């Protein structure tokens, strides 16, 4: 019922987290930050980044969320497992990204920019983090001017989805922290480490 679905979902997220972290180490300039600052950015933004992957995979579908290319949830299955509110919130993003026809390349740059825009509480070198954010923002602007010159403010339209992304990621974290405290769904240690941060 709800236990096996949430266990399946949380196992999927633990596998994604390993890939998230490996990918982030290759973001230009990220590894020039202190390890503490790298960890603070990731502990703030991991869920925003995971949700961007869901949105990306979910673009070919209508009213369904592709948590994995082999694990897709519609409205009723979300209701069966207590995820209807989160499913609806992530759908709101899928609507905005489907209308803008956001591309794979744009998702990867928005993930990196969301990471450096995290607004974490315990950053040791504000200037280094700001400089990384500026470069990643500039990368997106450069891409859009070169690849979509006839849509003058496309970058801004992408940026304007980031408040909803951060809002939805926070409520996802709260939801699965509540699942954690209930103790019925088993979770791997890395997922637990990110969730309890």
């Amino acid at each position: 019922g709800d236990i096996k679905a949430l266990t399946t979902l949380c196992d999927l997220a633990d596998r994604e987290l390993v890939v998230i972290i490996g990918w982030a180490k290759h973001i230009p300039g990220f590894s020039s930050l202190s390890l503490g600052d790298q960890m603070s950015l990731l502990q703030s933004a991991w869920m925003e980044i995971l949700i961007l992957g869901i949105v990306y995979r979910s673009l070919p579908y209508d009213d369904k969320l592709v948590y994995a290319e082999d694990y897709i949830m519609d409205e009723e299955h979300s209701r069966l497992a207590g995820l209807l509110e989160l499913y609806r919130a992530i759908l709101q993003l899928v609507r905005r990204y489907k209308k803008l026809k956001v591309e794979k390349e744009e998702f990867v740059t928005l993930k990196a920019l969301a990471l450096a825009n995290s607004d974490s509480m315990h950053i040791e070198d504000l200037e280094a983090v700001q400089k990384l954010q500026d470069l990643l923002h500039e990368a997106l602007q450069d891409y859009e001017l070169s690849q979509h010159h006839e849509e003058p403010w496309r970058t801004g339209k992408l940026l304007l989805t980031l408040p909803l992304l951060r809002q939805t990621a926070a409520k996802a974290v709260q939801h699965f922290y509540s699942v954690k405290l209930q103790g019925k769904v088993p979770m791997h240690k890395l997922f637990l480490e990110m969730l309890e941060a």
Binding site: I21, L35, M39, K189, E193
Partner: peptide
């Protein structure tokens, strides 16, 4: 806590 994250970023 960050034991696992810190090792994965170090290696």
């Amino acid at each position: 806590k960050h034991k696992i994250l810190h090792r994965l970023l170090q290696d």
